[PDB]
Enzyme design. Structure first.
Site, PDB file in Angstrom:
ATOM      1  N   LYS A   1      62.345  42.600  32.260  1.00  0.00           N
ATOM      2  CA  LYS A   1      62.740  42.723  30.865  1.00  0.00           C
ATOM      3  C   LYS A   1      61.552  43.290  30.104  1.00  0.00           C
ATOM      4  O   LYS A   1      60.449  42.759  30.184  1.00  0.00           O
ATOM      5  CB  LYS A   1      63.119  41.367  30.262  1.00  0.00           C
TER       6      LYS A   1
ATOM      7  N   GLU B   1      69.065  43.546  24.839  1.00  0.00           N
ATOM      8  CA  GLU B   1      69.124  42.264  24.156  1.00  0.00           C
ATOM      9  C   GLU B   1      68.774  42.323  22.671  1.00  0.00           C
ATOM     10  O   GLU B   1      67.793  42.955  22.276  1.00  0.00           O
ATOM     11  CB  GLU B   1      68.195  41.284  24.882  1.00  0.00           C
TER      12      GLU B   1
ATOM     13  N   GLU C   1      66.195  34.224  33.272  1.00  0.00           N
ATOM     14  CA  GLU C   1      64.826  34.615  32.925  1.00  0.00           C
ATOM     15  C   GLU C   1      63.941  33.382  32.734  1.00  0.00           C
ATOM     16  O   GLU C   1      63.080  33.359  31.856  1.00  0.00           O
ATOM     17  CB  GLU C   1      64.833  35.421  31.625  1.00  0.00           C
TER      18      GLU C   1
ATOM     19  N   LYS D   1      70.831  29.108  26.162  1.00  0.00           N
ATOM     20  CA  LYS D   1      69.532  28.455  26.031  1.00  0.00           C
ATOM     21  C   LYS D   1      69.777  27.021  25.582  1.00  0.00           C
ATOM     22  O   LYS D   1      70.223  26.776  24.454  1.00  0.00           O
ATOM     23  CB  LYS D   1      68.655  29.182  25.006  1.00  0.00           C
TER      24      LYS D   1
ATOM     25  N   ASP E   1      64.570  43.915  25.449  1.00  0.00           N
ATOM     26  CA  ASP E   1      64.820  42.959  24.377  1.00  0.00           C
ATOM     27  C   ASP E   1      64.126  43.548  23.157  1.00  0.00           C
ATOM     28  O   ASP E   1      62.894  43.634  23.115  1.00  0.00           O
ATOM     29  CB  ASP E   1      64.216  41.593  24.717  1.00  0.00           C
TER      30      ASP E   1
ATOM     31  N   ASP F   1      71.118  36.992  21.624  1.00  0.00           N
ATOM     32  CA  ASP F   1      70.141  35.932  21.833  1.00  0.00           C
ATOM     33  C   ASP F   1      70.039  35.141  20.542  1.00  0.00           C
ATOM     34  O   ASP F   1      70.686  34.103  20.391  1.00  0.00           O
ATOM     35  CB  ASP F   1      68.760  36.484  22.216  1.00  0.00           C
TER      36      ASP F   1
ATOM     37  N   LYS G   1      59.945  44.226  26.424  1.00  0.00           N
ATOM     38  CA  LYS G   1      60.051  43.968  24.995  1.00  0.00           C
ATOM     39  C   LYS G   1      59.819  45.274  24.254  1.00  0.00           C
ATOM     40  O   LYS G   1      58.847  45.982  24.524  1.00  0.00           O
ATOM     41  CB  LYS G   1      59.012  42.937  24.551  1.00  0.00           C
TER      42      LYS G   1
END
Ligand SMILES: [Mn+2]
Ligand SMILES: [Mn+2]
Ligand SMILES: [Mn+2]
Ligand SMILES: [Mn+2]
Ligand SMILES: [Mn+2]
Ligand SMILES: [Mn+2]
Ligand SMILES: [Mn+2]
Ligand SMILES: [Mn+2]
Lengths: 369, 369, 369, 369
Positions: C163, C220, C323, C269, C194, C245, C165
C-alpha cells in the site's frame, strides 16, 4: 457612526486593449465609485460590470440610479458600523441589483475597518495568505500574439497561469489555438479556458474532453448560464474541472449548483454576488458541498480588486488562485497606490481598510459629464 | 498579539434540578473554562456538553485533555487575532472534538473584540436584535408541576414559549401530557417538543400528526440522529416544523440535511458545531437552502450563553427564538454579571467582547480537584 | 462471572519509523491496554488510534478517561459473559467513543473465550482461514527506498501486496512514484494506494484513472470522509476498486455507503467500529449489499492485531486480504508471544482467547507516567 | 468433533385446529427433525414449512431429500464445531432450500452449545431478555369465536397481543370483524393483522388507513411478496407499521427492502432465512437501516420454537414481541419438556443448547411411514 451621505460617481476609464462584445467593441470600462461618509471618515466602494449590461443585467447607469434613488436614501441616518442591518435593509428594499449593493457593502467594510485600524481581511477574521497566484487572460484573438504575451509574462515572473477565451472561432480552431499555446508554455505554465456560454451541450461534450487531453486545467462556463443540467452532465463526464461564472448570482443559485455538484468550482465575484458577507456565504456553501472557490473578477479597478483580495485572502483554500487583473487592463489608475504583482502572485495591499485610497484628481478627470 | 498561554479549568456547577440521563441522574453540569492570554489581555471561552458523553461524544474530561495536549500547544506563539488561521490550524491538527475547538474559538473572539472595544456581535457585523424570545424547557416529569411552572413563567413575563421533553413515557401518555399543557396555557404560550431521538420512524409518523393537532409548533429530533431518511419523510409528510439537533455537527452534515430539506430548521449550537465562524457557516447553508435557524443550547453557563447570544443577535431571522436557559438551570454563576430575561426575551449583555467576566472566586470554588 | 474491575493503562511504544502527521512527526504510538477481571480470570483489550486525534477524534487520553469515568463503572458488577448486554449498555450510556468501547469489547471476548477454552475465532463461529495475505505500507517518502523495501519483502516471502500513501506530493509526482514501484515489482506483487482524504473530487476523477492504468488494484479514501457523493461518483466511473476507510464509523454509515454502492469495499477496523460484534454487523451489511470486506488496521500492537485476526479469520471472503502490520511498525512488543508472517500471510496465533498474553514487564516499562 | 452422521425424520403432527390453505384444509403440520451426531453427542434441529409448499417453495419432503442427498453427505467428516464453514459449504453446494439449511444449522448450534455447557443464546453472546411478549393468532373464521378466544387469553394472562388473518372475506367484512374484536378487548390488548398477500395495491391503500383508524397496530404482508414497490408506497403513506413476511428470504432481499424503507419491520424466521447466523445478519441489516425486528414463526414445534427463542432473546429490541405459538397449535409435543407461557410472555427454556430434548417415543410415533 451615523451615515451622513453616500455619493456615486460614474467614471469611464480607457482600457489598454479593446473589449469585443456582441456587436460593439468597447474601448473603456465604466465604474460607479461609491463613497460613504460617516463621522467625518470615508469608506470607498466600487460597482462594476463588464462592458455594460452584457456580462450581467446591470450597468454603471443602472447602478448609480439604483443607489441614488433607492439604496442611499434608506441608509442615510443609519449606523454605518452595523453591516448586518445594512445588508438586510438593502435586500428587503431592492430586488436584485447585487452590484449596486456590493458597492455600498464594500464602502461600509472599508469605513468600519479603518475606524478600527484593521485591514478588511483582518476585520473579516484574518489572512490565510498575503498574496495569491494570479491568472492572466489571453484574448488578443491571435495565436502568435497570445504565445508571445504568455512567454513574456512567464519570463518576467508575473504570470504562469493563463485563461484563454474561446467560443468566437470554431471549436476546431479553438482547439488548435489551445494546443499551440500549451506547446509553447510547456511545463512552465497552466492553461485554463472560458467559453463564455458559447457552446451548446453537445458541442461542449465533444470538445471539453479534447481540451482536457490538450492540457487544459479548468473550463469556465462552457454553456449558457441557465443550463444547470448541461453543466452537471459535463462535470460528471469530464475529469477537467468545470467552473461556474455566469450561472452564479444569488446565494440560492450557489446552493442549487452545489446540491448535485453541477460544477467543481465557483467563481466568487463580489459585485455579482452582492458584497463581502454575501460572497462569504457563497464560499461557505461551496466549502460545505465540496466545491472549490475561485477568485473571480469583473475587470475591476484597484478599488474593486483590493476589495476582492481582502476577501480571498481569508479563505481556507484557493486551488486555482484568482484572476484579479482589472487594474492592469485599465489604461490608468483611480487610486493613489498601485497593486503589486511579483513572482506570479498579486499582493494584498498593506494598511487599514482596503489599503488603497482614491486619487481625487484621477476620479475627477475620468468622471463622465 | 502572540498567544502567551491557554489555560483549561474544569468546573462542576450544581444544577437546581436533577438531570435524568440513560441510567444515572446527574446533579450538576461540568464545563471547561478556557482562558487565552495574549498581550496581557484575556479572552474567555467555554467547552460544554450535556450530562457528559451522553448528548455527544465529548465530556469536560476529553475537552480539557484535547486542548491541553493538542490544540493549546499548536496555538501558543501564534497571532491571537488571526481567527482564520486559528480555526484552520485546529481543524487540520485535530479531527472532531468540535466542543474543545469551540471553547478556544469563543475565547479568541472575546479577546479580539475587547482589543477593538467592540461586542462580539459588533465584530461579527452588527446586531439585528438586542434581545431574543426564549423558550423554557418543561421536564419535571409531572404534568401538574409543568403546568404550574409554565403559568408562573407566563405571569411573570419571563417565558411564553415552552419545550416539553418527550420519549420517556409512552406516546399516548406524552400526548395527554401535551394536551393538558396546551389547554392550560391557552393562547398565552406556544408549545414545542423534543423527543431526544426517542422514537423510531413509524412511532413518529403516527404521533407527530397528533402532536400537531394538539397544538405543538415544533418537533425536535424525533428519531435517532443518523436517520436522515426518516427525518426527511416525517418533514415531507407533516405540517408541524421538524427541528434537527443531534443530527447536526459538521458543516457537511448541515449541507446533507439541507440538500433535500430533511428538516425545516437547524438547532445552532456553538459547541457542537466547533465555534462562531463554523456556526455562521451552518447558518449560511440554512439560509441558502431555505431552512430556519434556531438558537440552541447545551445548558451552558453564562459564558457559553453570552457567546451564543452574540452570534444569534446577528442573524437575519430566528423564527422560533432561542433556548439559552443554561444560566438559570445552574445553581450558581461563574461570571460577575448575570444575564437578564425580561418580557419573554433574554437580553444581549452590554459591553465589549462577551460582555461578561469570570468571577474568579466562583470559578476557583467550583474547580474540580 | 461478575466483573470485578476494569483497569486502563496508557502505554507509549516507540515506532521503528517516524509518523508524519499534519505538522508534527510522531515517534511512537499510544495505546490504552484494557484488562477485565472476573472470576479470577483476565481478558485483555486494546484501545487504539493513529497518531492521536488525527485519524479519528479519539486519543489514548480520551479513551482512558471515557473508560475510567463512564464505561468501567457501568460494567463492574455485571456478568462479564453477557456480551450482548455489555455492548448495549455501553451504547446507551455513552455516545461515540467507539475505540474505548472496542477495547472493552475485545477484553470481554477474550475473557469469555478463554473460560470456554476456545479461540475468539472459534467462539465467533469458526475459522474460514488460519492465515491472511497481508499488505505492507510503503511510505518512506522516497521512491528508491520504497522499491528496495518492496523487493526485500517479496524476496523474503513476507509481503507481495503493498500500500502506497499518496496525497503529500503533487498528483503528477505521486503517479511517477507509483509507476516506478509497479515497474520494479513486476508481476510479483500488487500495488494499492491510500490517498488519506488528500484529493478533492476533480483531482481524484483525473488521477484515479491514471493510477488504474498504471496498475493500481485498490484506491483507499481518495476524498474527505464526509464526501459520500464524490466517493459514489468515483466508484461508478472507475474500474479500479475504491475502499472506504475514514468514511466508515457507525453501523449507520456502513448502510449509507452501501445503499447506493458508494464504494466497492469497506475497511473493517475493530476500534473505529466499536468492537467485534459491531464490526461483524458492518461486515454483514457489506455482504448483504455486495461490498467487499477488507482487514483494516490502526497500527495496533499485537493485542489489537490478534483481536482483528480472529474476526477476519471467520469472514467468508477477504478479496484484498488485510493490512495488520502494526506489530512490525512498533519497536517492541507488549505481549509475550510474537505474531508470525510467512509466505506472504500473517498467521492466526494458536490458543484460547486472543492467543496472546500481556508481557507485564513490557507493559510496565512503556506505561506513561 | 467430526460429524459422524446426519439423520432426517419426517414427522406428521396433528394440529388442534384445521389449517385452511388454497383449496385443501390440512389437519396437521409436517416437520423434518434433524439430528447431527458428533463425538457421541447429538444436536437437534427442525426444518419447517406452513401447510406444505404453500407459504414457501419447500416442504417436509423436499427438505428431507435435499439434506439426505446433498447437504448431509457434504458435512459428514467435517468439524461440527466450525459453524462458519458449515454455513458457507451449504450455501456453495446448494442454491436456496434455506429451510433445509436452517434445520442443520440449528442442530450444529445446539451441539456446539451443549459441548460448551452454554444455552444457544449464551453462545450467541448473551440474553437481553429471558421472556418475550407473544402474540396469538385469531383465525377461527368467526367473529364471536375470536372474541371469546381473545378474552379468554387475556383473562388467563396468556396473551394480550393478537394477530387476525385477513384477506379471505371482503375488505368491508374484514374491517367489521376487526372493529368488533377491538371493541371487545378494549385497552387490554393490541390487535395486529396479516393479510397474507391477499390484497392488490389499491385495495390495501384504501383499507389499511381504515384498519389503522380502527385501532390496528401492525399490518403484515398486505400485498404479494414480490411487490416491493407497493409495500414501499403503502409504508410511506400510512402511519400504522407495515411488516414484511413472505417478501423476506435471502440476505439480499432484506437489504433490498431496507434500502428505501419499503417496510417498517422484518419478520425474522429461522427456517425461511437459512439459520441462526443468517437470521442474525438480516437483523443486523434491519438495525443498520432503522427497521424493526419481529419474532416470526412457521408454526414450529417446540424444537424450532426453542431455536427461535434463543436467537430473539439476544436481540437489542423487539418492539412487537414475537408470535412463537407453534407448540400450542400442535396437538402433541415432540420434546420431553414443554415451553412456558406466563404473564403474556413465552419463556426461554433453561439449560444448555436449545434447552429441550427430543422425546423419542413421540418422534417414533409421529414418524411418517
Ligand atoms: Mn468532473
Ligand atoms: Mn467568465
Ligand atoms: Mn413539513
Ligand atoms: Mn435537543
Ligand atoms: Mn467502479
Ligand atoms: Mn486508510
Ligand atoms: Mn409508514
Ligand atoms: Mn405472515
Amino acid at each position: 457612526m451615523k451615515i451622513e451621505a453616500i455619493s456615486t460617481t460614474i467614471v469611464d476609464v480607457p482600457t489598454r486593449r479593446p473589449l469585443q462584445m456582441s456587436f460593439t467593441t468597447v474601448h473603456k470600462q465604466s465604474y460607479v465609485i461609491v463613497q460613504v461618509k460617516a463621522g467625518g471618515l470615508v469608506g470607498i466602494g466600487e460597482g462594476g460590470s463588464v462592458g455594460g449590461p452584457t456580462w450581467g443585467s446591470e450597468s454603471a447607469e443602472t447602478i448609480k440610479v439604483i443607489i441614488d434613488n433607492y439604496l442611499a436614501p434608506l441608509l442615510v441616518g443609519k449606523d454605518a458600523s452595523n453591516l448586518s442591518q445594512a445588508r438586510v435593509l438593502m435586500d428587503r428594499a431592492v430586488t436584485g441589483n447585487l452590484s449596486a449593493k456590493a458597492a455600498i457593502d464594500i464602502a461600509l467594510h472599508d469605513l468600519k475597518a479603518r475606524a478600527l485600524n484593521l485591514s478588511i481581511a483582518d476585520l473579516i477574521g484574518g489572512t490565510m495568505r498575503t498574496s495569491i497566484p494570479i491568472a492572466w487572460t489571453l484574448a488578443s484573438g491571435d495565436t502568435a500574439r497570445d504565445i508571445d504575451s504568455a512567454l513574456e509574462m512567464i519570463e518576467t515572473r508575473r504570470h504562469n497561469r493563463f485563461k484563454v477565451k474561446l467560443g468566437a472561432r470554431t471549436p476546431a480552431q479553438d482547439l488548435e489555438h489551445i494546443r499551440s499555446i500549451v506547446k509553447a508554455v510547456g511545463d512552465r505554465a497552466s492553461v485554463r479556458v472560458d467559453v463564455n456560454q458559447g457552446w451548446d451541450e453537445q458541442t461542449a461534450s465533444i470538445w471539453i474532453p479534447r481540451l482536457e487531453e490538450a492540457g487544459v486545467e479548468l473550463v469556465e462556463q462552457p454553456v449558457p448560464r441557465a443550463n444547470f443540467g448541461a453543466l452537471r452532465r459535463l462535470t460528471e463526464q469530464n475529469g477537467v474541472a468545470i467552473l461556474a461564472d455566469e450561472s452564479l448570482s444569488s446565494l440560492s443559485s450557489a446552493f442549487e449548483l452545489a446540491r448535485d455538484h453541477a460544477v467543481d468550482a465557483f467563481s466568487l465575484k463580489l459585485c455579482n454576488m452582492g458584497g463581502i458577507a454575501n460572497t462569504l456565504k457563497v464560499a461557505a456553501v461551496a466549502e460545505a458541498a465540496g466545491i472549490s472557490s475561485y477568485g473571480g473578477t469583473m475587470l475591476d479597478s484597484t478599488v474593486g480588486t483590493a476589495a476582492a483580495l481582502h476577501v480571498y485572502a481569508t479563505l481556507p483554500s484557493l486551488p486555482y488562485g484568482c484572476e484579479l487583473i482589472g487594474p492592469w487592463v485599465l489604461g490608468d489608475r483611480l487610486t493613489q497606490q498601485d497593486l503589486e504583482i511579483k513572482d506570479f502572485e498579486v499582493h494584498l495591499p498593506l494598511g487599514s481598510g482596503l489599503g488603497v485610497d482614491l486619487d481625487h484628481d484621477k476620479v475627477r478627470h475620468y468622471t463622465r459629464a
